[PDB]
Amino acid sequence: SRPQSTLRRAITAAYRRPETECLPPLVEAATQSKEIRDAAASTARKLIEALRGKGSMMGEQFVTGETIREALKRSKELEEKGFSYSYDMLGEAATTAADAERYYRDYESAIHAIGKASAGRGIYEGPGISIKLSALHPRYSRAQAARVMGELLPRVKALALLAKNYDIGLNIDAEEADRLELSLDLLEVLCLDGDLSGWNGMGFVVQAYGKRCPFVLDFIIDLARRSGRRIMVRLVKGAYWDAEIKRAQLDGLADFPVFTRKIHTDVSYIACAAKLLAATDVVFPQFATHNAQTLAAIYHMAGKDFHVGKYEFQCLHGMGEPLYEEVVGRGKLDRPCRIYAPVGTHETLLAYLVRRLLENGANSSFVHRINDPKVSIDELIADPVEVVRAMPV
Amino acid sequence: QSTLRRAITAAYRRPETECLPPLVEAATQSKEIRDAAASTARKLIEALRGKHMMGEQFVTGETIREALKRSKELEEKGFSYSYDMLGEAATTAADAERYYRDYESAIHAIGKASAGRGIYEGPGISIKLSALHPRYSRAQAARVMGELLPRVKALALLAKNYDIGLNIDAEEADRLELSLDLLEVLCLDGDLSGWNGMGFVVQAYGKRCPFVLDFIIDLARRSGRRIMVRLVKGAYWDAEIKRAQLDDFPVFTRKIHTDVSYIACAAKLLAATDVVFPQFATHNAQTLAAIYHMAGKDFHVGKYEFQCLHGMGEPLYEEVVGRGKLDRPCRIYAPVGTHETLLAYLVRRLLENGANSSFVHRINDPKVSIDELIADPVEVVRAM
Numbered sequence: 001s002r003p004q005s006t007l008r009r010a011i012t013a014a015y016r017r018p019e020t021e022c023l024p025p026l027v028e029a030a031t032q033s034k035e036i037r038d039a040a041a042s043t044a045r046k047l048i049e050a051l052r053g054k055g056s057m058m059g060e061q062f063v064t065g066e067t068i069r070e071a072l073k074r075s076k077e078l079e080e081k082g083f084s085y086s087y088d089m090l091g092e093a094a095t096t097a098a099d100a101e102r103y104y105r106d107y108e109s110a111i112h113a114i115g116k117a118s119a120g121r122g123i124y125e126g127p128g129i130s131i132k133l134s135a136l137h138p139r140y141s142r143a144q145a146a147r148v149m150g151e152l153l154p155r156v157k158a159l160a161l162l163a164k165n166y167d168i169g170l171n172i173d174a175e176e177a178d179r180l181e182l183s184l185d186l187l188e189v190l191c192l193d194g195d196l197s198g199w200n201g202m203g204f205v206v207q208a209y210g211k212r213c214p215f216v217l218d219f220i221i222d223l224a225r226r227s228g229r230r231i232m233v234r235l236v237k238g239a240y241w242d243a244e245i246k247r248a249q250l251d252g253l254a255d256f257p258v259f260t261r262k263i264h265t266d267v268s269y270i271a272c273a274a275k276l277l278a279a280t281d282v283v284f285p286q287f288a289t290h291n292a293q294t295l296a297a298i299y300h301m302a303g304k305d306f307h308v309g310k311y312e313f314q315c316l317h318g319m320g321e322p323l324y325e326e327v328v329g330r331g332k333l334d335r336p337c338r339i340y341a342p343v344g345t346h347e348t349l350l351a352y353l354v355r356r357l358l359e360n361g362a363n364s365s366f367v368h369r370i371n372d373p374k375v376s377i378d379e380l381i382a383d384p385v386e387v388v389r390a391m392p393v
Numbered sequence: 394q395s396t397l398r399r400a401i402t403a404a405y406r407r408p409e410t411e412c413l414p415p416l417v418e419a420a421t422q423s424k425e426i427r428d429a430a431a432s433t434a435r436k437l438i439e440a441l442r443g444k445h446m447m448g449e450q451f452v453t454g455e456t457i458r459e460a461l462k463r464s465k466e467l468e469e470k471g472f473s474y475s476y477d478m479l480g481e482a483a484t485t486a487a488d489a490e491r492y493y494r495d496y497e498s499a500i501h502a503i504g505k506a507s508a509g510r511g512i513y514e515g516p517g518i519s520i521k522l523s524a525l526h527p528r529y530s531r532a533q534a535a536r537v538m539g540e541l542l543p544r545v546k547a548l549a550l551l552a553k554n555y556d557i558g559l560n561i562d563a564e565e566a567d568r569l570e571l572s573l574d575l576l577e578v579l580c581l582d583g584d585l586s587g588w589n590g591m592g593f594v595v596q597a598y599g600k601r602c603p604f605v606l607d608f609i610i611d612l613a614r615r616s617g618r619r620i621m622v623r624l625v626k627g628a629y630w631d632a633e634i635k636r637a638q639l640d641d642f643p644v645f646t647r648k649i650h651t652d653v654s655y656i657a658c659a660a661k662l663l664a665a666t667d668v669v670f671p672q673f674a675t676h677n678a679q680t681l682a683a684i685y686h687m688a689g690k691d692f693h694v695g696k697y698e699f700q701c702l703h704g705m706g707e708p709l710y711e712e713v714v715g716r717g718k719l720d721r722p723c724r725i726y727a728p729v730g731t732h733e734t735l736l737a738y739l740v741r742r743l744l745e746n747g748a749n750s751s752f753v754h755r756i757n758d759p760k761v762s763i764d765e766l767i768a769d770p771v772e773v774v775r776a777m
């Protein structure tokens with residue numbers, strides 16, 4: 001039958017499976033032993049106690065620099081501490097060809113600058129780049145997949161070839177739900193392209209608030225096995241939740257492509273981490289979160305054996321450094337963290353900044369709850385898997 | 394339909410190149426006024442530059458009782474308030490009913506706090522029609538307006554009972570006509586006779602703005618209601634641009650064109666203060682200075698007022714209100730509610746404060762000179 005028919009059918013089938021039908025297998029994947037659960041709660045308490053023991057709306061704290069040069073110069077402090085970086089030249093959803101070409105030239109120039117600064121440190125210990133496919137096609141969300149792929153793939157391949165030249169990471173950011181299949185098809189074409197052989201820096205984001213997440217992960221892990229590439233997989237919860245809810249309503253959809261209860265995203269994330277941690281031979285998991293409880297859960301789930309290159313954590317510049325200062329370093333948790341680092345002017349920042357406001361301002365967000373006088377540390381270290389597992393059915 | 398309504402619909406998506414020439418001519422001020430406005434603007438901006446994501450800066454209080462207590466300090470300085478129970482784009486009947494009960498409760502508390510001070514010296518309320526109908530942006534006008542009207546009329550009757558102002562906020566461009574039809578039914582309804590508190594917002598970034606204003610001024614003259622007209626630039630520009638691209642624009646696309654539209658519409662409103670109550674809502678000191686001198690030397694309470702958003706306008710208007718400044722009143726738009734209902738409003742404040750074209754961003758930008766800040770937008774548009 002069609003290549004990867006079973007894996008692809010599973011993804012499409014999940015795209016709007018009832019949320020109640022998506023949950024049970026996730027809870028089974030995410031359940032841990034009492035030793036791990038106790039260890040996790042103990043670590044999360046320590047992290048929160050340190051955090052509460054120690055952000056401006058205008059978002060200056062969210063950009064590392066106006067240019068890649070300034071961004072690279074300002075990164076030496078935290079790299080000396082054991083952090084790494086992933087630089088994102090701000091820009092998305094190009095509306096004209098002129099803009100899409102400027103963004104492409106921005107990524108191209110940035111890869112040259114990051115690659116020189118990496119100075120051969122490789123994809124795990126050295127910096128990398130993150131790109132958005134919507135910046136590289138002037139009608140990314142509107143045009144037919146054939147025309148989009150055909151003009152996008154040459155550009156992304158050229159960028160991946162430069163990143164291979166310097167041996168740095170190149171991560172494809174995850175954006176809106178309706179573009180997941182195109183981006184996955186692009187990942188598969190690159191991972192099977194022989195011109196990129198021998199380079200493991202190709203990376204891909206999967207959003208755990210999506211119903212497709214574990215099946216997308218199944219597909220990617222299988223792709224890593226058949227292609228021979230160790231794919232970098234950034235596991236996130238997701239940055240577009242408000243926009244997806246609204247788009248699903250105006251499109252007349254009966255069922256959303258994303259979870260509607262925040263705890264379900266939490267359990268989905270842990271279930272997907274378990275899948276990724278069992279596959280570190282062929283993928284490099286990158287656990288992007290600012291939630292101390294989520295982090296503690298992954299840390300103890302990953303077991304006691306660790307080496308750089310096994311997995312890493314990630315955080316956004318201006319949000320995660322206080323938490324991960326309690327994580328990076330032999331004297332803390334001895335695990336690395338890559339900082340996603342925006343580069344650009346105030347104007348290019350606003351769309352990213354809106355997503356940060358929706359993140360930092362939501363009552364349900366960890367970063368809001370940690371500053372909330374009415375949220376107890378009891379509630380902050382609460383285990384979302386065990387909370388769900390305990391509800392009688 | 395009517396000739397005044399037709400001009401509004403004809404203007405909806407009119408080419409921006411055809412909207413501008415009449416606005417420039419209507420916005421043109423005498424050299425004497427422009428020199429005085431330049432001088433007042435520089436004084437304000439110099440004072441402003443001498444001064445300086447939980448969103449706490451933008452909320453007056455979690456409850457109306459809380460917000461009312463915190464208002465007495467600024468009220469005696471010369472400010473008034475328009476309280477907004479946060480809430481918008483209700484998605485279910487339960488939300489719509491709850492927002493209605495919030496507005497109802499606020500009116501009772503604000504009206505009792507007002508204690509007969511009237512619509513110009515006492516506090517008032519602002520509402521959003523999208524809070525009061527479950528599918529406001531997604532249903533048709535006949536269904537929306539016919540279930541919305543009884544609810545808005547009931548609130549207007551409470552506001553009349555207390556003699557406070559009740560303002561309908563302006564939202565997305567495709568809802569203007571619906572809200573405009575509601576305004577007309579209310580202004581011709583005999584149950585509201587003698588109350589001048591009905592208020593309406595008009596967005597100067599919209600190409601229809603001057604024609605909406607003509608319609609409203611004529612409606613006030615023929616109905617005998619002194620409609621309160623809040624002239625704003627507009628809060629939804631990025632969303633209007635994106636919707637039209639995904640779907641010509643109903644809004645201008647150069648910031649300076651909106652600035653010219655505002656001044657032209659302010660000239661229209663200043664000539665009509667007999668029949669409407671203009672409320673010039675802006676944090677831009679150059680815009681404020683222009684309006685101040687356009688209005689002339691004659692002033693009395695109830696002629697017109699300025700307005701600002703809580704947490705944004707106090708540094709500017711502390712240089713305006715009071716007998717030692719410019720002796721003009723300013724009404725503070727005061728959101729009330731939890732941090733949850735705050736988020737949508739906060740996003741619009743972020744786009745406002747963080748845009749490079751915004752006055753409140755440029756006033757803090759060391760790359761922007763005072764000369765650039767007092768620049769007259771009408772004169773800049775003429776040259777280019």
Ligand SMILES: Cc1cc2nc3c(=O)[nH]c(=O)nc-3n(C[C@H](O)[C@H](O)[C@H](O)COP(=O)(O)OP(=O)(O)OC[C@H]3O[C@@H](n4cnc5c(N)ncnc54)[C@H](O)[C@@H]3O)c2cc1C
Nearest residue numbers: 173174236237238239260261262288289290291315365366
């Ligand atoms: C380095 C880095 C890179 C990232 N890259 C991407 C990317 O390419 N694409 C992308 O989409 N996201 C990306 N994210 C994630 C996004 O930007 C947010 O940072 C992240 O979702 C916050 O989750 P958390 O574990 O920090 O915190 P939490 O406070 O634990 O979780 C918050 C998240 O819960 C989810 N959520 C909130 N309410 C509900 C609800 N009612 N129902 C279901 N789910 C809900 C949302 O995803 C929300 O962001 C990235 C994050 C980091 C740190």
Ligand SMILES: Cc1cc2nc3c(=O)[nH]c(=O)nc-3n(C[C@H](O)[C@H](O)[C@H](O)COP(=O)(O)OP(=O)(O)OC[C@H]3O[C@@H](n4cnc5c(N)ncnc54)[C@H](O)[C@@H]3O)c2cc1C
Nearest residue numbers: 562563625626627628646647648674675676677701751752
């Ligand atoms: C008390 C009060 C009540 C308000 N009520 C409403 C309301 O009900 N509905 C509503 O929509 N707005 C409303 N506004 C206006 C909106 O919220 C902003 O506060 C206002 O638009 C900012 O204008 P300004 O004169 O302060 O600043 P400025 O910096 O002078 O002007 C900024 C404005 O220019 C416009 N603009 C920016 N870029 C462009 C561009 N490229 N092309 C064309 N135009 C552009 C936008 O409207 C932007 O807000 C209100 C404002 C106040 C103070």
Ligand SMILES: O=C(O)[C@@H]1CCCO1
Nearest residue numbers: 173174239340352355
């Ligand atoms: O752009 C965003 O908001 C997310 C976070 C980093 C990459 O994709």
Ligand SMILES: O=C(O)[C@@H]1CCCO1
Nearest residue numbers: 562563628726738741
């Ligand atoms: O809601 C908004 O953003 C504008 C400002 C005040 C009323 O409508």
